[PDB]
Subunit: 167 residues, 8 copies
């Protein structure tokens, strides 16, 4: 008929681990300037912990990000972000970018007249902030840029989609 | 069409004893550290009594739990917990975990922004607390962890589902 | 479609005498400890009188009851109780139990969080108390236990069901 | 679909005389103890007069009645009662009984919790009291017992049913 | 579907003269005791005048009437009455009787509990009083009895029915 | 389905001149007593002017009229009347009569209890008064009688009908 | 189904120039008494300017007009009028006439009881006045007569229709 | 069925770069009077920057514009305008023109009685102003004329359409 709201969100699976580690791409491909390559992508997942929480970033001047390569255009309804657990990290902002097809260039998340919006980070560590995105995000390659940093950035995340599903 | 609310709950059968004793799995597989192996799983069922109420746990530091192995992904609408009858036990909290397929790892019950919730235990023994779970729980293997303890934990339980059924 | 409320109740037939006397089972199978075997089951029926009202019970410490063996799982919408006519008997309480299939064990009537309810008896003799049961009772073998006693228990009863029927 | 209310009542025909005289049965089969056998059944019909109104009853201690033998289970929606015209007769009460099939025994009219009701008679003679019966009466053999008497009982009556009919 | 209200009334035709004169039957078959046989039935029709208005009646002690023989069971929705034009005649009352089939006996118009009603006549001559009858009158032979008289009775009339008709 | 109200009126055509002059019949067939035979029927049409407005009438004591012979039973929803233009003429009243089939006799316009109504004429000349007739007039031969006169009567008119039409 | 309101208006095309110049007919066929034949019909179109705005009229005593010959009966929903641009011209009134078929005679725009209406002209030059016509105008040949003049009349116009169209 | 509002807007793609550079036509075909031919059309796109923002215009007296040649009649629901980034530029107004078919002449955007509207420019540079156009613009060749200038005009833009799309 037409997309609804929704009524319920479908987590993709970062806690369940439906997503493969190969689809969590970290900025700094050298991984020695904006990462230590430890903590791994598997730690950078919602409620994943016990040996490191999040991904790390050695240098970061809001030109570091975390990408989710879905390799299929999917409809994303929200972005869950959770703090680390090593030491405290204060609220940041997010720039939501997405690209479909893995072609052309990237475009920005829009929300009303003004046509953009940044979402709040994690105020105090080891807690999840639920940033639901009202319009449906048609994305194949997602880029979540954390803007601002308390020392460095280190988030854990899971995406919410929507499957009707109905029973 | 789509899952409703519901309008009526369907007990699985712990009082009726539809569930086999083989599907009530207790933590501590040694059963001599977090159990005495007496009281049995049949006693640990809603309104089952006359020779022991609940399951016992010798040691427990909120790392003991009771699991319901359904061996079929079912839709759970509530968790009934009832106190023991030997001696008093005060309110505890619950962590609701579930896993489908008997694969991957376990995930947590979510309820709104903040994405978690713990449910209240039994305030005074030999009484049932009705903890209905608003969203439908898609689970094959259920883990109910009791958090906190008045000496030890010992609950009796039955699950509520939903069958339409209609007449 | 789905069960309604109802809009009208269908008496099974205890006054009409649709029920056979063979389906009214009295506690105390010895019938010389919790009965005199006079008054008979036919007297223990709604508005049946003229030679004894109700069934009698010599001893009773709330472990005497009256069962209706339907021998078919039926949907019961209410329990009518009427006092005796020999001498006065004051209000009692009822425990409503039912079992389907004539298998497993018995289960209790539930009504909201707390999951049980007892119904009021007959305040003053020779008068009918209409205890309607809001959810539909799926029962094959009904056990109505009278709790409390003014000397002894002695009730007359008829069940209400629901047939749509429509014209 | 289902019985309605109604919207209009259908008189059976006592004024029209659709009913045969053979279907108006009077109590006292001797007809010399609770009747004089004059006034006849044809006089005991709504608005029938000119040579005697109603049926008479010599003795009556509320164990005299008038029955309508329909010889077909019909749906009765009301009972019209009209006073006599010989001499005044004051309000009485009615007990409404009915039996279907011409088998088993008789059952009582029910109206709410308490499960019975008596209807008002004719306050002052030669006037009709419209006692509509809210639930549909499934009856084959109707017994209207007049309770109380100003000297004796003597009513004229017609039944109301319901045919949709629609045009 | 079912008879409506209506929304519009259909005059039978007394003004149009659809009705034959042979269907307007006057009381007093001698026509020399309760009529002069002049004024004729054609004058006794709504808005018929110029040589006598109405039908006359020499003697009348409310046992004179005017009948409409439809010779087909029709659904009558109202009775129009109009005064004469010779000399004044004051308000009377009407008893509405009808009979179907031209068999059995006659029955009375009913309106609510009390089961009867009389309608108002013409207050001052040469004016029409619209007496609509709320329930549909199933009649083949209509008898309109005028009760009371200012010297004598003399009305002009037309019946209203209902044809949907719809366009 | 059924006639509506309407929502829009359809002029027959007196201004357009759809009506033939042969269908506008004037009273006084001698045309030398209640007419001068000049002004012609073509002048007696809504907004027809330039050489005489309306039809004239030499003598008239409210027994002169203008008829529209439709020669087909049509549904008339209103009567437009417009004043003349030679000299002033004050408000009159109208009696609306109609006859179908060109058989039987004529009948009167009815509007509520009282069953008649007269419509207002033209207060001041050369202006149109819109007299809409709420119920649908089933007419083949229309007679509009002007009652009262300021010297004489002289109206111009057009009829309104209703065609759904819908687009 | 039936004509709507509308929801959107469809300009015919005078600005777009869908209308051919051959369909804009000016009064004064001599074109030397009520026109100079310069300004041309192409200038007399909504927002047409740059070398003369409107059509001119040398003499005009409200017996000059502009006609739109559609040569197809179309449904007109509004009349747009725009002022000239040479020198100021003050508000005028309009008489809206139309004729279908190019047969019979012309008829007037009606709006409620009183059956006519004139529309406002352009208060100050070079500005458009939107005169929407509530009922649908069934016209083949449109005549817009400007009544009153500030020196002379000179309007620019475009018609609004309605096409559903829907997407 | 019919065009909706919408519920969501579909950007054509100037940020995504769906539009080819060949469809962004700039006024001044000499490109040395009202342009420097640097900044290019690719810079004159919503959120395109890093080496020049917008298109430039050397001379401009509100007779310079930017056109979008769609080469297909499309339904445009809004015009996004964004400021430059070199130096500040203050709010301007817009004239929205469009032409379909690439034939006839151009027509103006209308909004209510008065039939035109200009939209607000960018108050302060490097910010987007969302000018949604309430009626659907049927256009093949779009001309956005900026009226007024703070030194010169230089806007970046993207169009919004509407695809239902529905999921």
């Amino acid at each position: 008929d037409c997309i609804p709201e929704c009524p319920y969100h479908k987590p993709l699976g970062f806690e369940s681990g439906e997503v493969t580690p190969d689809q969590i791409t970290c900025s700094n491909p050298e991984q020695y300037v904006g990462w230590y390559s430890s903590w791994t992508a598997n730690k950078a997942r919602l409620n994943s912990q016990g040996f490191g929480c999040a991904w790390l970033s050695k240098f970061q001047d809001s030109s570091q990000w975390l990408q989710i390569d879905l390799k299929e255009i999917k409809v994303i309804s929200g972005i869950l972000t959770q703090g680390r657990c090593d030491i405290d990290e204060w609220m940041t902002k997010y720039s939501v970018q997405y690209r479909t097809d893995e072609r052309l260039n990237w475009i920005y998340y829009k929300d009303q007249t003004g046509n953009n919006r940044v979402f709040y980070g994690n105020s105090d560590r080891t807690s999840t902030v639920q940033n639901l995105l009202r319009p449906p995000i048609i994305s194949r390659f997602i880029r979540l840029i954390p803007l601002g940093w308390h020392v460095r950035i280190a988030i854990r995340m899971e995406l919410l989609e929507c499957v009707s599903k109905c029973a």
